[PDB]
Design a binder for this molecule. Structure first.
Ligand SMILES: C[C@@H](CNCCc1ccc(O)c(O)c1)c1ccccc1
Length: 160
């Protein structure tokens, strides 16, 4: 037969003193992609956007030297305004070159009051069992936390 692939999930939250709608509005903004290096000081050696920024857009990203991974492409695969849920898939390169067969980020912006919310970020991946110990330490909440940190700051400042 084949040995089962292994599934791993990691999770990150950031509480934010702004409406779920204000935060959701930036995460789902088709204009965000182009602005990513404005939101992340460096990190990008290169960023090519294929598509209009909306769902179906492919981002091809090269990272400054050292940074693992160095290169990968990501695709915006779902926007759900009713749930404030967005999904972004890693589609080529990156961890897919280290025995990972599926890598999906989900962001869910959840109201905590009239004027507060929590950004729930998760990554789910499927990995060949002999590669689990290799990738386990490489795949972290770092990138989701960095996205939530930048968007949180942008929105709180746009309204202070
Ligand atoms: C590329 C990002 C994480 N993925 C970001 C995907 C995305 C694009 C456009 C969006 O409007 C959005 O909500 C998510 C990243 C961060 C730090 C370090 C490395 C990568």
């Amino acid at each position: 037969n084949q040995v089962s692939t292994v599934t791993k999930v990691i999770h990150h939250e950031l509480e934010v003193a702004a409406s779920a709608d204000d935060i959701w509005t930036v995460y789902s903004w088709p204009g965000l992609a182009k602005h990513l290096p404005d939101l992340l000081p460096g990190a990008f050696e290169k960023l090519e956007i294929i598509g209009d920024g909306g769902v179906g857009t492919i981002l091809d990203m090269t990272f400054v030297p050292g940074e693992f991974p160095h290169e990968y492409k990501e695709k915006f695969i779902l926007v759900d305004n009713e749930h404030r849920l967005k999904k972004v898939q890693m589609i080529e390169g990156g961890y897919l070159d280290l025995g990972v067969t599926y890598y999906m980020d989900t962001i869910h912006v959840v109201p905590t009051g009239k004027d507060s919310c929590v950004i729930k970020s998760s990554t789910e991946y499927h990995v060949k069992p002999e590669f689990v110990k290799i990738v386990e330490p490489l795949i972290t909440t770092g990138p989701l936390a960095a996205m939530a940190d930048a968007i949180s700051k942008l929105v709180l400042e746009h309204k202070s």
